[PDB]
Design a protein around this ligand. Structure first.
Ligand SMILES: NC(=O)c1ccc[n+]([C@@H]2O[C@H](COP(=O)([O-])OP(=O)(O)OC[C@H]3O[C@@H](n4cnc5c(N)ncnc54)[C@H](O)[C@@H]3O)[C@@H](O)[C@H]2O)c1
Lengths: 332, 326
């Protein structure tokens, strides 16, 4: 009986898991519906499965008073007002682990593609003009490089594991230090944010988007980079000031920027750019992907399953395993 | 000062190291000059620093009787008649293996780029049409995949090393098998050529080119492949049959092909293709690189430096460290 709205397309097997417990109102197409259309569907929904284009604020919740649970098919719930969910007695749940590994893979791929001029290399061969080896496309590889992680959580760790054996010197700065056991095991040295940006050949971002991280990578910080340094962003766009990244690119201090994420995606920002600057889109020392960190079908299936288990738990009157927040529940 | 012709562009610092010992006739441009032109340059040269696009046969050597050293900024001598060099008392020089590692880095970059549709994804956002996350561009990860190496010398090992931590299942076929200790270390399962192609999600090539290896990856073998299998060629072009790969791509059994090397490059074969098929070139499930395996700045510098020192040693009258002959 309880209505559940699902804002984007999910695997058949997921609908089968839910269909006995809920009234599914699904978006089994390839499109992102309108803000006003999801509001209408959610108006008396007991439940919601949310995805990356979703944004949930106190305004949204006011118009949807039957909501008991919002199940997020994602890790970074920055576009979801958790306090306001709590104020309305709505569970919010996320997916803590399943997005990690394929995002870590993409990022290393970006680091390699960016450092080796893959976009133009490939464009060149595709132009038909290839005739053999030339003294051209000399790049930056991982061997002997200083690699710097900003952040050292799930993707931080999964990337460092993936770079064991690459002959790089690994260093990091994070809100919380890793125990000495993990540092020695992964070859990781802890350094300050300033030192990270001044010494690293590659700088890989692995931070969530919050108030302390908004525009953390800025002109002051980019002004510090060794000339030609490569910056890689698989996490959230507004951890970076995209305009200062452009400027470091044009002056040739920053060697390259790769990103899977963009400022324009951060819906909880009133003042978000409405687009990626065409000038960064067209800069040659770049490589981009459309938020496909977790775009592997087998993985997406499990992300959906995790979200569905959470939603179903919540509707069964239990505390969901991946609740980010806390509601009153009866004791023994 | 003995005269030295540098066949292609080097870093300023190789010039600076060499000027005080050699008259330098350089080619500080992007172009590889015609062999007529390199022959003109080398008529009375004492030394030559050669690169990948150079070929040296008896005929070349006949036209250059004052040549003492060929110092090569490369490692394979397919393009080089070694016995001609020695017959005419010319040192033929190689560099140590600085090339394997950056090539292995690129190879994994390619497998990831190919599996995750990097070219198409990049173009999509550069188009300015990106409106945030969509449930498409689904791709293939390495995690839980089976990756099969065809071959396992220096390149096979470099790549296997770099794939520890990636949670894939590793397997290989090679003429020269690995010792048990390393198989153990690397989680590497040894299989037959047929089983490798039948059970690999990614197949990464690590083979030399020779008679036994010519068109090894042919239609019969590709026909065994799992639907959507991803093939990566960073080793040599002519170990695969590009027509057979294209054909495999077009029917959709092979999910993708990435290469840094192409048949048109293999100048030993008389029957070699004259370019890369434009329909392969135009295929969406590809990813290509213009033989940039070792195109890392630090490495190219060290490569030229080793070439230079071999040349200097030969001239001052010593046996060069990396002499391939005598
Ligand atoms: N591209 C994608 O598709 C994709 C996929 C998954 C996650 N992400 C994003 O990447 C982010 C990180 O993912 P995760 O799974 O590793 O998250 P996580 O919560 O496991 O780790 C976050 C880490 O950042 C650190 N941190 C927080 N504030 C910091 C600060 N001010 N300075 C330095 N370090 C700080 C924390 O100590 C923690 O170690 C997610 O929050 C999400 O926003 C993107």
């Amino acid at each position: 009986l309880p209505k559940l709205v699902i804002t984007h397309r999910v695997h058949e097997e997921i609908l089968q898991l839910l269909a006995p417990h809920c009234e599914l109102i699904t978006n089994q197409t390839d499109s992102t519906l309108t803000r006003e259309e999801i509001l209408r569907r959610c108006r008396d929904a007991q439940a919601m499965m949310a995805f990356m284009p979703d944004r949930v604020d106190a305004d949204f919740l006011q118009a949807c008073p039957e909501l008991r649970v919002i199940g997020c098919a994602l890790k970074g719930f920055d576009n979801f007002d958790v306090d306001a969910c709590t104020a309305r007695g709505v569970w919010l749940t996320f997916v803590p682990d399943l997005l990690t590994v394929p995002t870590a893979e993409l990022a290393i791929g970006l680091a390699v593609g960016l450092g080796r001029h893959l976009r133009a290399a490939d464009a060149f061969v595709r132009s038909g003009q290839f005739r053999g080896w030339q003294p051209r496309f000399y790049g930056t590889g991982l061997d002997n490089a200083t690699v710097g992680f900003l952040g050292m959580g799930a993707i931080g760790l999964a990337m460092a594991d993936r770079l064991q054996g690459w002959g790089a010197t690994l260093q990091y700065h994070a809100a919380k230090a890793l125990d000495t056991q993990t540092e020695q095991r992964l070859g990781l040295r802890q350094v300050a944010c300033s030192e990270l940006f001044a010494s690293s050949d590659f700088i890989l971002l692995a931070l969530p988007l919050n108030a302390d991280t908004l525009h953390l990578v800025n002109a002051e910080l980019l002004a510090l980079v060794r000339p030609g340094a490569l910056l890689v962003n698989p996490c959230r766009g507004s951890v970076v000031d995209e305009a200062a990244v452009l400027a470091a690119l044009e002056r040739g201090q920053l060697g390259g920027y790769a990103a899977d994420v963009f400022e324009m995606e951060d819906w909880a920002r009133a003042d978000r750019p409405q687009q990626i600057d065409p000038a960064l889109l067209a800069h040659p020392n770049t490589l981009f992907t459309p938020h496909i960190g977790s775009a592997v079908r087998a993985v997406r299936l499990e992300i959906e399953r995790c979200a569905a288990q959470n939603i179903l738990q919540a509707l069964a009157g239990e505390r969901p395993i991946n609740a980010v927040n806390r509601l009153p529940k009866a004791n023994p």
